[PDB]
Design a binder for this molecule. Structure first.
Ligand code: HEM
Ligand SMILES: CC1(C)[C@@H]2CC[C@@]1(C)C(=O)C2
Ligand SMILES: [K+]
Ligand SMILES: [K+]
Length: 405
């Protein structure tokens, strides 16, 4: 459904892209977003979908906008406006200078010290999961590996019972790829409602887990509050449950379709980190945005105070003006340009955990199950949203071609 074009928005710039159901979805979700970068399309368009908002279609604009928090505020970062307005997660709903004291804390609970401490656990789980599936000669990758591998590590990191995963994952899905069953507002409130007693408990009896660290944390050297803690913990939950999960599925689908790429990594495993970066570019999956703080002309376009602008992190790296042949996966790409983990002061702090989980997955899978394919006839469907994803991924393989390692 199309919202009436506001008086200030030039009609020639109208491109009715729907970020939650793009027209060319069947071609692939990155492919469907890439329609915004065909030859006839401007750098900055207005869609009347989802309440009406701007979309920057090119990496140069996306980067510039994320650097300029003065004009492009985090305070309303989701589309539609209702979701953006209800979105009060910490730190991402705050701009500098206010954001900063909270980000230091959030950066602590997922940073490299934490990851290295988890390295053994991550290793064991991946190998455990994969070795289980190996003689079976088949799996649904989304539920057999893509979900349980990162989620179990996160739940472990957070100190939360795995029993809760189906609920918490439903809530997170609705915030990024809504069913229609919940508003972002509703799902956010439910996640907050879950966390409240848990935070009170961790404050009374301080522990070593991510939630204890936040809940007992200090900001600017002063006591974080219960409300502040809730707002920060909920966001970590979203990060921990709905990013790597989805990226893993884009990567494995591709690897399942590309024997030559799998061979590359089988023969020269030392390339796996590079392959990781390139997959992060090619199958980049996040797209949120900002809200105009005041009337502002940006690349010859008059933006009005209150306007929302989608600034798709996904698109920077698929921009042919950043990467030649951007839809080709080249593990030896010399300059792998992307903004997959964001750009500007909100740049992802969990990226180290993401890379670790990615590289470990690539390394343990190809070592044990080097030869696999998509189940015959399966027509893989993607889903689009704040964070895009893969609906289902049935893999098959011959057990006789595997290695117990
Ligand atoms: C492939 C995996 C991931 C991708 C592609 C990704 C992407 C992003 C992007 C694009 C942003 C910026 C959002 C904005 O500017 O509005 C962001 C921020 C953030 N991410 Fe990641 N993320 C991933 C994994 C994770 C994980 C595993 C965690 C935590 C366990 C996490 C936690 C966070 C947090 C807390 C922020 C907010 C930082 C701030 O606002 O200062 N992310 N991420
Ligand atoms: C857009 C994000 C990936 C980033 C971390 C989780 C997420 C959904 C947010 O709300 C901020
Ligand atoms: K107009
Ligand atoms: K808000």
């Amino acid at each position: 459904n199309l919202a009436p074009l506001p008086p200030h928005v030039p009609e020639h710039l109208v491109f009715d892209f729907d970020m939650y159901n793009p027209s060319n979805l069947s071609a692939g979700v990155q492919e469907a977003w890439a329609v915004l970068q065909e030859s006839n399309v401007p750098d900055l368009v207005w869609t009347r979908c989802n309440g009406g908002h701007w979309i920057a279609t090119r990496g140069q604009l996306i980067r510039e906008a994320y650097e300029d928090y003065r004009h492009f505020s985090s305070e309303c970062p989701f589309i539609p406006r209702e979701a953006g307005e209800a979105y009060d997660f910490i730190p991402t709903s705050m701009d500098p200078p206010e954001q900063r004291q909270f980000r230091a804390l959030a950066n602590q609970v997922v940073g490299m010290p934490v990851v290295d401490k988890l390295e053994n656990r991550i290793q064991e789980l991946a190998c455990s999961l994969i070795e289980s599936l190996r003689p079976q000669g088949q799996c649904n990758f989304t539920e057999d590996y893509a979900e349980p591998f990162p989620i179990r590590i996160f739940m472990l990191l957070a100190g939360l019972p795995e029993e809760d995963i189906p609920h918490l994952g439903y809530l997170t899905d609705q915030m990024t790829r809504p069913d229609g069953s919940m508003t972002f507002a509703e799902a956010k409130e439910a996640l907050y409602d879950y966390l409240i007693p848990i935070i009170e408990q961790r404050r009374q009896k301080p522990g070593t887990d991510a939630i204890s660290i936040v809940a007992n944390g200090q900001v600017n050297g002063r006591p974080i509050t219960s409300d502040e803690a809730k707002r920060m913990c909920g966001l970590l939950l979203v990060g921990g449950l709905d990013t790597v999960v989805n990226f893993l599925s884009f990567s494995m689908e591709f690897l399942a379709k590309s024997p030559e790429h799998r061979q590359e990594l089988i023969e020269r495993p030392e390339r796996i980190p590079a392959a990781c970066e390139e997959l992060l570019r090619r199958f980049s999956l996040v797209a949120d945005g900002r809200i105009l703080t005041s009337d502002y002309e940006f690349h010859g376009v008059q933006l009005k105070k209150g306007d929302q602008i989608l600034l798709p992190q996904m698109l920077s790296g698929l921009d042919e003006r950043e990467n030649a042949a951007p839809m080709h996966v080249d593990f030896s790409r010399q300059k792998v340009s992307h903004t997959t983990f964001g750009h500007g002061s909100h740049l992802c702090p969990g990226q180290h955990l993401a890379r670790r989980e990615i590289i470990v997955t690539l390394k343990e899978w190809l070592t044990r199950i080097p030869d696999f394919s998509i189940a015959p006839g399966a027509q893989i469907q993607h889903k689009s949203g704040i964070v895009s994803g893969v609906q289902a991924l049935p893999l098959v393989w011959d057990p006789a071609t595997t290695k117990a390692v």
